[PDB]
Each structure stands twice: as structure tokens, then as C-alpha cells.
Amino acid sequence: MRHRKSGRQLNRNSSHRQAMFRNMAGSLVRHEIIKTTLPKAKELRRVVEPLITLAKTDSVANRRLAFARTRDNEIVAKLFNELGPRFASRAGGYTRILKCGFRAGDNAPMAYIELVDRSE
Amino acid sequence: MIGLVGKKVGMTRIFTEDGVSIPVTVIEVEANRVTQVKDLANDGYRAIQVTTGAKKANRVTKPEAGHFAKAGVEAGRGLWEFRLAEGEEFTVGQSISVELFADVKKVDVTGTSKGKGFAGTVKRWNFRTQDATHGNSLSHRVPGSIGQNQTPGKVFKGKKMAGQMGNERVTVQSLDVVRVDAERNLLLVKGAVPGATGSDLIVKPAVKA
């Protein structure tokens, strides 16, 4: 009954959870701005920030391991080149969450999530 | 004589000279300070109120801050009252050490057990699970019958069914203490104590033989 346990269920099984985490993380790293629910972004952090930390070091093995996630060559290409130097001098906290109210369709807690600076 | 109040950080086995492993519980105890002393004249009974640990000044509000300042004691995590032994006397503000448990050799530990939330009948009262086959339908862990026919016409109080377990005081008696450390402020007691790691524990001398 959840004693020192982590990992939300999101009303999905492991395969769907992993797939939609992967799609969400790819969309975020592509766009640098995503609006979604609070738990979804909170669980996104634990996938994207380690991905950024892995991308901080550029190597063929590191690039292959990164490609094992997000299943996208363009996503990895954007990594190790753009977000690497930007977050090279940053130790964690690459993403931040800004609440923006609730949806009008299902009344779900909405929040924007973005990077630190976004170069904008 | 009185006991101490401490916090559990974990439990680990202890190796003896003959190789026998003694699993004991590690409880850290801070130097308690007496905050109040009660007497027959004012409260009608003798007891001493003590505190342990430290609390942040911002979280501490004015009432308990003034209560602590009256006794000259700093902020503490919580307050507890210990009954004396008809002749033992304590003064306000003196610190309580740990070496006084060098001769009791038997302690009683009370604390808040791990909360299991809303538990079922099988898990709560150790009931017997019904058969999962032979035509059984929608009744596996259900309590089943909870009373007789209309002649009583009611359900008696204290009947056993599902409820909330844990998050309550649990007392374990006749626990052997192995080693006590004064310079490090640790107590080693044989056996298992109720509660989780980091929970506040109250240790008292054994009342039984």
C-alpha cells in the first residue's frame, strides 16, 4: 500500500506508460514548451532531466544509448549539440512547471512545462 | 525511575563472541530536558514533562516558545510526561542522560506502528479465505456471516470486520537491552520495535518480571 514507493500509474499499463512518456519527452525536447497535467509533467521530469544529463556527455556509446530512448534520430541530433552546451554548466533542474488552471472539457489541472532559458 | 524518549534509525544484527547473531534495534536518544515538574499540591500527582530533539524557530509558535522559556529550555520536537516511582525527584531544566539504563536489563518500547490504511478482514483479524473454486462466486475474502437470525436482531459491538490498521500506539513488553552508548547516544535493544524508521519511540522500564 505504497510504503516508500514511487512511480505513478496514470491509469495505464507499463507499455502504454512508457510509450506516452517517450512521445511526450520527444515532443518537449522538440518544442521546449508543453502544456499538460501536473502529474504527467512531474513524471516527465524524471525522464527528461536524466536524458539531458546523459546528453551532457557526447560519445558514440552515449549517442546510441540516447537513441535507444525517444526512438528518433532527429531528436538525438538536436541533443548533444544544442541542449548540451546550454545545460553543461547546470547541475539538474533543467525543467520547470508553471500551473495554468484547468481545462474546460474535463476539469483537469493544466500546467506548462519548459526548459530553463529556452534561448528566447 | 523513568525511561527515555528516542527515535529509531534502523536495526541491525550483533555478533557475539560465540558467533550467535543477535538482531537488535538501533534507537538514537537525545539528551532530554525537564520542562515541568508536577506535585501533589498543584496537580494532585507527581510527573515530569520532558522534550527531545530540536525544532525550527519559525515553526515554533509563541505559546510553546514561552513555555520553553519559562523552564529555560530550548525548542524541542515534542513533549511527553513520565510518572515517577514514589520517591524519585527531578528538577526543572536538568538534562537526562542515557547511562542510567546500565542495570535495568529489561525495557518496554511504545510507539506508533506502521499505518496499513483500510485493511480487509483477512489481513486485519487473520480470517480464513473461502474456497476460490467449486462454484464460489464473488466471495473470496468476504467476512461472511456477521450474526445470527432475527432472534438477536442486531449486530453486537466489537464484531470483527475490515477497518483501519496502524497509526496507533503499540506496546511491546520484556525487551532485552544489549548495549548502551553514552558518547554516541545510542541504545541497542534485542528484538523488533513497532513503528517505521524515523518515528518517535518511547522506551520505559519493564513492569513485569
Binding site: 508553471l98 500551473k99 495554468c100 488552471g101 506548462y112 528566447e120 | -
Partner: protein, 56 residues
């Protein structure tokens, strides 16, 4: 399981005492535009902690 007697309107309204909604009182006051918004939330135009957060 079904009712044996009809409950009165007194019972209905007496059950609904705890169903009353709770209303916010002190949502927030913006330090730049001075518009109401939810606590720890951005405003209508994406203002939080004085600085723009959404850039439209």
C-alpha cells in the same frame, strides 16, 4: 436492498448539509499587472512572479 418508507424532504436537505461548496477568498494579487489569479498559477496573460512566462 430497497427502501421501506419514503424519506422526507427534511432528511434530503439534512444529508446535503456537508455537500455545500467551498469558496476561495484570497486567490492572489499580481505585483506587476494587479490581476487576480490562482495561488502558484499564471494569470490570464501568462504572468507569474512579475515576469512573462508564456510569451503568447
Amino acid at each position: 436492498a430497497v427502501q421501506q418508507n419514503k424519506p422526507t424532504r427534511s432528511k434530503r436537505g439534512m444529508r446535503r448539509s456537508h455537500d455545500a461548496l467551498t469558496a476561495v477568498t484570497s486567490l492572489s494579487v499580481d505585483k506587476t499587472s494587479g490581476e487576480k489569479h490562482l495561488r502558484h498559477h499564471i494569470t490570464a496573460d501568462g504572468y507569474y512572479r512579475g515576469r512573462k512566462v508564456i510569451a503568447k
